[PDB]
């Protein structure tokens, strides 16, 4: 006797979507979540911050994402463009260089090497591919070196190296010395290439949902009602020939199938009986979360526009950030959003909380003008202290893992299927990846219930 | 109101010893253990195997270890020498080279480069030291490269490279492509150097306890009686100004202090409120267990002695092992013990269980003679599937961790102290390290109770 046909573990976008798809087909589903809320790495509030709704977690929609805007449209949400006209900045240890709209500065001496370094990164990624990078002829050697070592071999310009460093520390939440070059190259390729992922007004960053991204999982949970269990951290998965028992301490739920819709690092904390096969076990233990904080400051007006700036900036150097204008037309304040990750977040963490705030305002004053001192609101979400997540924005892998265990990202283990963005064939790391992996896992389980 | 003055988490050698020291001073202690037994990475049975007691986990005592033999003597255990006269083997993809006792073969062409490679490894280790390798001027650069890259830069001989590869894959349970050179160099230095750790009849490998190493923790648990809780996996640690609450799901124990006597990977599965400081959090999430299996075959007689062989062998190549004669004079059969780790264990895992057994016998036949076919008993302990351990013999670290978070191996966090072998100033990775770290943590807490 089963409590459900399928138990979905994790109420992020991936698990929420998988649960919705199965529920919509008349499958009996339970959606179990460790935290006191749904959303996972997505997390927003309409009312808690002055100036309008605010997203603490992921919030950008990409121009080639289709499951995410289609689901948002089905749930009654509306999008708005994130595209901000004006010059992006490229800042090198506080030395401001003004872009031409989203392009490198007019006759920057590093423009040509940046272009070549992006072509070479794309080419390395193409050699790996997204379907089976672990099976690629090139992968063993690339997976034995770090991104930092690849930069030392292939990049001469300090500017180009600093741009690559901010992008790895943010997009993977980890230092170029910590990430496998094979993992990085694969990651960027499977996100439609480097220009896709680093777009300030194109590629992965073009739109938002009015009212916050957390609405996606909240509206799904409303419809699932009593089949959602919060404060239900999964501690043990048992499997036998007829089903799966999922435990939260002594609390237990029995189903025919289970979908793990959480990162490999989440899986590593659970006890499996029988034990997982070896590649999946190594993958869970050795693919950690990156580290990222999201800092937001609100103001009366997007005063950066007085210098004709977009508010986007590659803030490069020892305390690197990716900065955006996060303002919506429906908001009553303007927002600057800054991301800081990996080794730059380690430095950020070494500062006192008051030093961090003062330092972030000094950056904004340097880049955007003195009106940056006239703050209305200052907030940080440090993803490293979020219980049952412990990092952001994504899973990364150190040397030797992708080539030896990557095939375990996607493969079911008996009656346990993997969703979560890390299992998506493309757009792993993104909400779109979360939905595609949820779709895949719901379809696989639905075929096994028929 | 407290259930105890101190809760010790983990009944390996480290936690068992810390609990004993506090208990012996009249401190009220609870010792909580996830598994259905004590011992952790130590695990033995006097009666379950034919031919005498057998150790599934760690069992060697080193010639410079003093807490381990002193504790064994206090508990009424007896030691026996593990030293086996005769020629050790050096085998390169099945090509047998016969040592002179424990020394390289007479006029081996690789003898000189092996000697130089050991001096250079020792020198790199000395530059880091054991007291604070994370603070060493050299550490950032060494911690940005793998052991494999250091071998490619410093070692020319295929034989020397294959010896280094079997030693890293066994002593760290991980591939030379996965381990930071800084972590490896530090690890070997803090174990009194490479010759210490690779001794077949000297250094770290000279003696055993008659009746098995599991006796150490079992006899401690007998005296602690009802203050030992088995099947009590810690899921949450909460701290406040007056004490520590330790949870196993809804079950809870309150004390004034807590000692975590388990690897950083064990800590990563627990939820901390308040959250841990950042370096300790990164350390727990990113310092994984190695992978190791221990294969044992018993025979009527140590037939290898008919060729004048000790039974020790560096079995090098694509399926590498460290082999020992594991026979005690009090045993009624002779034992060959083989360790296989890291990338060699990945290959081992890719074979069927029957292929693995056939392959191990073919190795023994090649090295030691045809009488290796006349088996009495065959057993494997795969440490990767042991619940709440998930690996062996030790914690390792990938690039970038030791230099950025290593200072969190030893430092208390408010009322939570760290024991476990990984916190030992020297002999981290070893039972001796486990006892020294338990001693340190019990002394620190005892001073705070006074
Ligand atoms: C600061 C930040 C900014 C980002 N920006 C963007 C962006 O702009 N665009 C984009 O596309 N993506 C972005 N992302 C990434 C995006 O948030 C993730 O790709 C997405 O949320 C992944 O969805 P998921 O369902 O696979 O996993 P998660 O969102 O991580 O959900 C996993 C769920 O599983 C739960 N869980 C964990 N362990 C257990 C357990 N033992 N028992 C039960 N439940 C458990 C977790 O609590 C969580 O709710 C960002 C992320 C962060 C951190
Ligand atoms: C195959 C093998 C051979 C080895 N050979 C040798 C050798 O010859 N000589 C040598 O000196 N060393 C050897 N070792 C290493 C030695 O076994 C370890 O260094 C030693 O056991 C470490 O002791 P420890 O107490 O620090 O940790 P552990 O032995 O790992 O004990 C930790 C305990 O914490 C428990 N625990 C984990 N998570 C939780 C939780 N959430 N709640 C409660 N409890 C928890 C575990 O179950 C475990 O019992 C070997 C190890 C292996 C695997």
Nearest 10 degrees: Cα torsion A171, A175, A180, A186? 10
| Residues of B in Cβ contact (< 8 Å) with A143 | 177
- In this structure, chain B runs to a length of 450
Q: Is the torsion defined by CA of B370, B372, B375, B379 positive or negative?
A: negative
Q: Are residues A404 and A274 in the same domain?
A: yes
Nearest ligand to the C-alpha of residue A8?
1
Cβ-defined contact of A404 to B343 (cutoff 8 Å): yes
Q: Residue A352: how many CB atoms within 10 A of its CB?
A: 9
C-alpha–C-alpha distance, residues A35 and B251, integer Å: 19
Q: Where are the alpha helices (DSSP H) in A239-331?
A: 264-268, 278-286
What is the SS3 assignment for B107?
coil
Query: Could you give the CA distance from residue B284 to residue B270 in angstroms, rounded to a whole number?
Result: 10
Phi/psi region, residue B51 (left: phi>0; alpha: psi -120 to 50; beta: rest), is: left
> Which experimental method was this entry solved with?
X-ray
Q: 3-class SS at A289?
A: strand
Cβ of A327 less than 6 Å from ligand 1: no
> B204 and B102, same structural domain?
yes
Same domain? A372 vs A404: no
Helix (H, G, I), strand (E, B) or coil at B178: coil
What resolution (Å)?
Answer: 1.9
User: From the CA atom positions of chain B, what is the Rg in Å?
Assistant: 22
Cβ–Cβ below 8 Å for B285 and A146 = no
Which of residues A198, A233, A249 is at a domain's end? A198
Query: Would the CB atoms of B146 and A144 count as touching at under 8 Å?
Result: yes
Residue A387 and residue A433 share a domain:
no
CATH number at residue B442: 3.50.50.60
How close, in Å, is residue B44 to chain A by CA atoms? 21
Q: Which of B238, B211, B188, B269 lies closest to B10, judged by CA?
A: B269
Burial of A151 (0-12, 13-18, 19+ CB in 10 A): buried
User: Which positions in chain A touch B148 (Cβ < 8 Å)?
Assistant: 144
Count, in order, helices (H) and strands (E) of chain A: 15, 20
Segment holding B195, helix H or strand E: helix B194-198
- Considering the domain architecture, whether residues B55 and B204 belong to the same structural domain is answered as yes
Q: Three-state SS for A22?
A: helix
Query: B299 with B336: CB under 8 angstroms?
Result: yes
Domain count, chain B: 3
Is residue A91 domain-shared with residue A45, that is, in the same domain?
A: yes
Cα separations in angstroms, B397 against A178, A252, B179, B403: 11, 35, 6, 10
Q: Are B298 and B374 in contact (CB under 8 A)?
A: no
Q: Which residues of chain B make contact with A343, given a CB cutoff of 8 A?
A: 400, 404
Domain span at residue B176 reads 107-198
Contact A177 B291 (CB under 8 A): no
State if residue B294 touches ligand 2 by the CB under 6 angstroms criterion: yes
Backbone φ and ψ for B188, nearest 5 degrees, come out as -70, -45
What one-character DSSP code corresponds to residue A374?
Answer: S
Q: Which of B233, B271, B400 sits opposite A178 (nearest CB)?
A: B400
Collapsing DSSP states into helix, strand and coil, what is residue A409?
helix
Contacts of A142 (CB under 8 A, 6+ apart): A124, A127, A128, A180, A181, A182, A185
- Residue B53's alpha-carbon distances to A448, B48, B193, in angstroms, are 48, 8, 31
DSSP bridge partners of A97: A90
Contact of A5 with A227, CB cutoff 8 Å: no
A32 Cβ neighbours under 8 A, 6+ residues apart: A7, A8, A9, A10, A11, A229, A232, A234, A246, A248, A253
Half-sphere exposure in the Cβ direction for A246 (13 Å, CA): 30
Nearest to A398 among B343, B349, B399 (CB): B399
Q: Which ligand is nearest to the CA of B228?
A: 2
Cβ–ligand 1 contact at A435 (below 6 Å): no
Please report, for residues A411, B59, B229, B270, the alpha-carbon distance to residue B388 in angstroms, rounded to integers and kept in the order given. Answer: 24, 20, 15, 11
Within a 10 A sphere around the Cβ of A97, how many other Cβ atoms? 18
- Pair (A310, A415) in one structural domain: no
Q: What's the CATH code of the domain at A361?
A: 3.90.660.10
Q: Do A387 and B178 touch (CB under 8 A)?
A: no
Same domain, A133 and A249: no
- Which one of B249, B250, B275 has the shortest CB-CB distance to A385? B275
Test the A interface: residue of B150, B390, B406, B407 with most A CBs within 10 Å: B390
Instruction: Please provide residue A95's backbone torsions phi and psi, each rounded to the nearest 5 degrees.
Output: -85, 105
Considering only CB atoms, which chain A residues are within 8 Å of B252?
none
A386 vs A34: CA distance, rounded Å: 11
Please give the radius of gyration of chain A, using alpha carbons only, rounded to the nearest integer.
22
CATH code assigned at A157: 1.10.405.10
Q: Do A380 and A424 belong to one domain?
A: no
From CA B54, how far away is CA B45, in angstroms rounded? 6
Same domain for A436 and A377, yes or no, is no
Burial pattern A52-88, b for ≥16 Cβ within 10 A else e, equals bbbbbbbbbbbbebebbbebbeebebeeeebbbebbb
Asked if residues B306 and B323 have their Cβ atoms less than 8 Å apart, the reply is no
Cα A78 to Cα A207, A218, A282, A432: the distances in Å are 10, 15, 41, 17
Q: Name the E strands within B93-221.
A: 95-98, 207-209
Same domain, B32 and B134: no
Final residue before a domain boundary, out of A135, A163, A198: A198
Q: b or e along A421-431 (b: 16 or more beta carbons within 10 Å of the residue's beta carbon)?
A: bbbbeebbbbb
Residue ending a domain, choose from B143, B165, B198: B198
Residue A404: phi and psi, rounded to 5, are: -105, -20
Asked if A30 and A55 sit in the same domain, the reply is no
Helices (H), B287-430: 342-350, 353-368, 401-405
Q: Which residues of A touch B175 (CB under 8 A)?
A: 400, 404
**Helix pair B13-23, B67-74: axis angle to 10 deg:** 60
For ligand 2, atom 35, the nearest C-alpha belongs to B10
Rounded Cα–Cα distance for residues A312 and A292 (Å)? 18
- Interatomic CA distance for residues A201 and A191, integer angstroms: 16
Count CB-CB contacts under 10 A for residue B210.
17
Q: How many CA atoms lie within 13 A of B167 on its CB side?
A: 26
CA dist A425 and A216 (Å) reads 22
Return phi, psi of residue A395, to 5°. Answer: -70, 140
């Amino acid at each position: 006797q089963t409590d459900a046909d399928v138990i979905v573990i994790g109420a992020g976008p991936s698990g929420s979507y998988a649960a919705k798809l199965l529920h919509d087909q008349g499958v009996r589903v339970k959606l179990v979540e460790a935290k006191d809320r749904v959303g996972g790495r997505t997390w927003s509030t309409k009312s808690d911050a002055p100036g309008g709704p605010i997203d603490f977690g992921g919030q950008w929609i990409g121009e080639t994402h289709v499951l995410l805007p289609e689901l948002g449209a089905e749930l009654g949400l509306e999008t708005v463009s994130s595209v901000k006209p004006g010059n992006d900045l490229f800042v090198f240890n506080g030395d401001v260089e003004v872009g031409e709209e989203d392009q490198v500065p007019s006759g920057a001496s590093w423009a040509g090497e940046l272009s070549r370094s992006f072509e070479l990164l794309d080419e390395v990624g193409t050699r790996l591919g997204w379907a089976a990078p672990w099976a690629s002829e090139h992968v063993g050697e690339l997976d034995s070196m770090t991104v930092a070592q690849w930069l030392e071999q292939n990049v001469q310009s300090s500017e180009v190296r600093l741009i690559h460093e901010v992008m790895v520390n943010i997009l993977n939440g980890a230092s170029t010395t910590e990430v496998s070059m094979a993992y990085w190259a694969y990651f960027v390729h499977q996100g439609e290439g480097i220009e896709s992922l680093i777009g300030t007004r194109s590629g992965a960053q073009v739109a938002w949902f009015i009212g916050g991204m957390g609405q996606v999982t909240e509206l799904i949970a409303d419809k699932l009602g009593d089949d959602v269990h919060l404060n239900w951290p999964v501690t043990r998965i048992e499997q036998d020939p007829t089903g799966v028992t999922v435990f939260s301490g002594e609390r237990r739920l029995r189903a025919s199938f289970a979908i793990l819709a959480a990162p490999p690092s989440a899986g590593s904390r659970m006890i499996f009986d029988p034990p997982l096969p070896p590649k999946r076990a190594q993958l869970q233990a050795r693919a950690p979360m990156g580290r990222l904080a999201k800092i937001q400051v609100r103001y009366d007006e997007p005063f950066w526009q007085e210098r004709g700036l977009s508010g986007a900036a590659f803030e490069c150097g020892d305390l690197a950030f990716w900065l955006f204008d996060g303002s919506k037309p429906t908001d009553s304040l303007a927002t600057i959003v800054g991301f800081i990750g990996g080794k730059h977040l380690d430095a950020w963490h070494a500062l006192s909380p008051n030093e961090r705030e003062k330092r972030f305002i000094e950056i904004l004053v340097n880049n955007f003008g003195d009106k940056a001192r006239d703050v209305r609101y200052v907030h940080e979400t440090d993803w490293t202290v979020q219980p049952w997540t412990g990092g952001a924005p994504v899973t990364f892998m150190p040397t030797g893992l992708l080539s030896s265990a990557g095939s375990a990202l996607r493969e079911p283990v008996d009656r346990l299927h993997f969703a979560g963005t890390e299992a998506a064939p493309m757009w792993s790391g993104y909400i779109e990846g979360a939905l595609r992996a949820g779709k895949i896992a719901a379809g696989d389980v639905l075929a096994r219930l028929a």
